[PDB]
Amino acid sequence: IGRSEWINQYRRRLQQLSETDIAVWLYGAPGTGRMTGARYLHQFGRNAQGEFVYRELTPDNAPQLNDFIALAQGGTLVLSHPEHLTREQQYHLVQLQSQEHRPFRLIGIGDTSLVELAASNHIIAELYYCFAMTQIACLPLT
């Protein structure tokens, strides 16, 4: 079973995760150190040099999505409460990821795994598609 195996197993995911440009979904209850993973992931990321932007998406700010993408460019982009985003907005996001070379590394931070979000609140399948492989439960490295 193991006690600290989970962290190393969790830690192992980050180490092997860092090379890939694939979107990572970091989820769990707050204080689970998911935020710490993104910075760690970004810091150990190839695009560490690139701007690192994290946005918590209130409805009022959810509209000016584009500024984050433009500002965020060449570097990791971190967002939460992605569920708010318009289907076209979800799709925009999703389309950019498709290119062989990603414009930005996309990390999704959630209380819960997508699926339970996607089920609970509708999320487009395409957006889900990148997410499904990368959806992770953060473990406190402290």
- DSSP for 35-99, written as a single string: HHHHHHHHHSSTTTTS--EEEE--TTTSSTHHHHHHHHTTS-EEEE-GGGS-HHHHHHHHHHHHS
How far apart are the C-alpha atoms of 14 and 28, rounded to whole Å?
15
The SS3 call for residue 136 is strand
CA distance 75 to 50: 4
Residue 128's H or E segment, with its range, is: helix 125-134
Distances, alpha carbon 19 to alpha carbons 8, 15, 44, 60, 119, in Å: 18, 8, 9, 34, 30
Rounded-to-integer distance, Cα 114 and Cα 128, Å: 7
What is the DSSP track for 19-30? Answer: T--S-EEEESST
Helix, strand, or coil here: 102?
coil
Query: Residue 135: which H helix or E strand, with range?
Result: strand 135-137
Residue 89 sits at the vertex; the CA angle it makes with 19 and 130, to the nearest 5 degrees, is 30
Q: Which domains are assigned to the chain?
A: 1-142 (3.40.50.300)
Of the chain, the end-to-end C-alpha distance in Å amounts to 20
Single-letter code of the amino acid located at 96? L
Contact of 44 with 18, CB cutoff 8 Å:
yes
CA dihedral 62, 67, 70, 71 (to 10 degrees): -110
Helix (H) or strand (E) holding 107: strand 106-110
Please enumerate in sequence order all residues whose Cβ is within 8 A of that of 12, keeping only pairs 6 or more positions apart, or say none.
none
Closest CA to 35 of 141, 113, 125: 141
Q: Which two tokens stand for residue 14?
A: 């980050």
Do residues 107 and 76 touch, judged by C-beta distance below 8 A? yes
Measured torsion, CA atoms of residues 31, 34, 36, 42, in degrees rounded to the nearest 10: -170
